[PDB]
């Protein structure tokens, strides 16, 4: 009911959220890694294992995916021309050097969801192989291409309930390993994603009606098959691998991260999984010199909402009357992961929102300034550098000096749009100049 005004009376910011008004929140409860670590319940070793699993799979991935040293990775690129365009358009200096992480151009799905999805399928494939007696961790994993492996994996099934890039990632990886795969999808999903899945031997089942009881009925249907696996800490750990990989990319480049060369990362957020896991890996890798922020659409501030109020999964955005409708489809998630909120709160410097116009304008501007063409969701991070540079409160609370700031790296994490078909790109570009 109108008891939304009670929440506002206790948490004033909740009122800007309702007004769909662009908001920035700096977390007073951000902490050092040492102080923050306990609440995640994953170590550096859990993360080191994930890398080692992926290394072991490298000779496999390289042969199975010609593009993919067998690593599914993305470029990080400097974007100085985009950087001046933002200063000219919005009038706030961006100190330091703005960069773009192009997870939008990752193999298989052209999405951050590749990281988590692929790691999840690969962990499960490896597990079944090990237990069957077909493989040890000392083997060259190119063996999983053999006729006997293919026949072995085809006796097992993977079922997933996603309509997004995650389903695309798991579908293709699962098919390539050689599982029977069924992605359960809503009729709402874009035609090219169902086509790519099917072009790769995946079974796509669509639901006009009650995508939710279809999905959860599939889960129960799959529970009475012991050979069906139905799709998280594994996903989380999959994203978390991005941390050391980006550190390995800066060392190559000669890019320093220090108390005097701080790094800021701006991460688009839907339910929390992707950006949570990426934040965690970054924290292990760089420590208290990486300052992480989540970005959400004004029409979908689920995590900001949950972290600001301290409620987490207690509250949806629909509860306070926000309609959860946005051009950033893959961030249009009305309730945040409780897990990530609690696990990651202390490790997030703040969270902010932007609206659909800001995403479209910046999308057009990026293309015009750097030739890089992305989707709206992927622009979420782009607004962050100026939120940070503008706030002297935040700067002073974290002890940032003007010269630390001038040696800053601002890293915008692009999350999708590499595999957007031409006619959809024209749609995005036709809303901002």
In DSSP notation, 175-206 reads HHHT-EEEEEEETTS-HHHHHHHHHTT-EEEE
Closest residue by Cα to residue 26 from 337, 354, 408, 345: 345
Phi, psi angles (nearest 5°) of residue 58: -45, -55
For residues 26 and 20, give the distance between their C-alpha atoms in angstroms, rounded to a whole number: 18
Q: What resolution in angstroms, rounded to 1 decimal? A: 2.4
CATH of 111-231, one of 3.40.50.1100, 3.40.50.300, 3.40.718.10, 3.90.1640.10: 3.40.50.1100
For residues 135 and 138, give the distance between their C-alpha atoms in angstroms, rounded to a whole number: 8
Tell me the technique behind this structure: X-ray
Closest residue by Cα to residue 273 from 244, 252, 303, 301: 303
Contact at 8 Å (CB) between 431 and 202? no
Identify the H or E element spanning 118: helix 113-132
For residues 116 and 234, give the distance between their C-alpha atoms in angstroms, rounded to a whole number: 8
Closest residue by Cα to residue 30 from 257, 244, 293, 240: 293
What lies within 8 Å, CB to CB, of 218 at 6+ separation is 159, 161, 182, 184, 205, 230
Q: Which CATH architecture has domain 1-110+232-433?
A: 3-Layer(aba) Sandwich (3.40)
In the numeric block, the tokens 């696990």 are attached to 343
For residues 284 and 236, give the distance between their C-alpha atoms in angstroms, rounded to a whole number: 14
Do β-strands 290-297 and 263-268 pair in parallel, antiparallel, or remain unpaired? parallel
Q: Report CA 30 to chain centroid distance, whole Å.
A: 21
Contact at 8 Å (CB) between 344 and 284? no
> Could you say which DSSP state residue 322 is in?
-
Task: Kindly list the strands in the beta sheet with 228-230, ordered across the sheet, starting from the edge strand earlier in the chain.
Answer: 203-207, 180-186, 157-161, 228-230
Calculate helix-pair angle for 242-253, 233-240, nearest 10 degrees. 0
Cβ burial 232-247 (10 Å sphere, 16+ → b, else e): eeebbbbbbbbbbbbb
Contact at 8 Å (CB) between 375 and 422? no
For residues 392 and 407, give the distance between their C-alpha atoms in angstroms, rounded to a whole number: 16
Identify the H or E element spanning 353: strand 348-354
> Could you say which DSSP state residue 38 is in?
G
Residues in the chain: 433
For residues 239 and 282, give the distance between their C-alpha atoms in angstroms, rounded to a whole number: 10
Structure tokens that stand for 118 in this block: 């692929």
Start and end residues for every CATH 3.40.50.1100 domain found in the chain = 1-110+232-433, 111-231
For residues 425 and 231, give the distance between their C-alpha atoms in angstroms, rounded to a whole number: 30
Beta bridge partners of 410: 98, 264
């Amino acid at each position: 009911m109108e008891n939304i005004q009670k929440l506002i009376a206790r948490y004033p910011l909740v009122e800007d959220l309702v007004a769909l008004k662009e908001t920035t929140w700096f977390n007073p409860g951000a902490t050092s890694l040492a102080q923050g670590l306990p609440y995640v319940g994953l170590t550096e070793q859990d993360v080191n294992a994930a890398h080692d699993r992926l290394a072991r799979f490298a000779p496999y991935l390289a042969k199975a995916f010609p593009q993919t040293g067998g690593m599914i990775e993305s470029d990080v690129v400097a974007i100085p021309a985009m950087q001046k365009r933002l200063e000219k358009e919005y009038g706030q200096t961006i100190n330091g050097e703005m960069l773009l992480k192009k997870d939008s151009h990752l193999a298989i799905s052209g999405s951050i969801k590749a990281r988590g999805g692929i790691y999840e399928v690969l962990t499960h494939a490896e597990k079944l192989a090990l237990e069957a007696g077909l493989l040890t961790t000392d083997d060259d994993y190119s063996v999983l291409l053999s006729p006997e492996f293919k026949q072995f994996f085809s006796q097992y099934s993977i079922a997933v309930g996603s309509t997004g890039n995650l389903g695309l990632s798991i579908g293709i990886m699962s098919a390539c390993i050689g599982f029977k795969v069924t992605v359960h999808m809503s009729a709402d999903a874009r035609a090219w994603k169902k086509a790519k899945l099917r072009s790769h031997g995946v079974t796509v089942v669509e639901y006009e009606d009650d995508y939710g009881v279809a999905v959860e009925q599939g889960r129960k249907a799959a529970q009475s098959d012991p050979n069906c696996f139905f799709i998280s800490r594994t996903l989380f750990l999959g994203y978390a691998v991005a941390g050391q990989r980006l550190k390995a990319q800066f060392a190559q480049q000669g890019r320093v991260v220090d108390a005097s060369h701080p790094l800021f990362v701006y991460l688009p957020c839907g339910v929390g999984g992707g950006p949570g896991g990426v934040a965690f890996g970054l924290k292990l890798a760089f420590g208290d010199n990486v300052h992480c922020f989540f970005a959400e659409p004004t029409h979908s501030p689920c995590m900001l909402l949950g972290v600001y109020t301290g409620l987490h999964d207690a509250i949806s955005v629909q509860d306070i009357g926000i309609d959860n409708l946005t051009a950033a489809d893959g961030l249009a998630v009305g309730r945040a992961s409780g897990f990530v909120g609690r696990a990651m709160e202390r490790l997030l410097d703040g969270l902010y929102t932007l609206d659909d116009q800001t995403m479209y304008d910046m999308l057009g501007w990026l293309a015009q300034e750097e030739g890089i063409r992305l989707e709206p969701s992927a622009l979420a991070g782009m607004a962050g550098p100026q939120r940070i540079c503008a706030s002297v409160a935040y700067q002073q609370r974290h002890g940032f000096s003007q010269t630390q700031l001038g040696n800053a790296t601002h890293l915008v994490w692009a999350t999708g749009g590499g595999m957007v078909p031409e006619d959809e790109m024209e749609q995005y570009l036709a809303k901002g100049r």
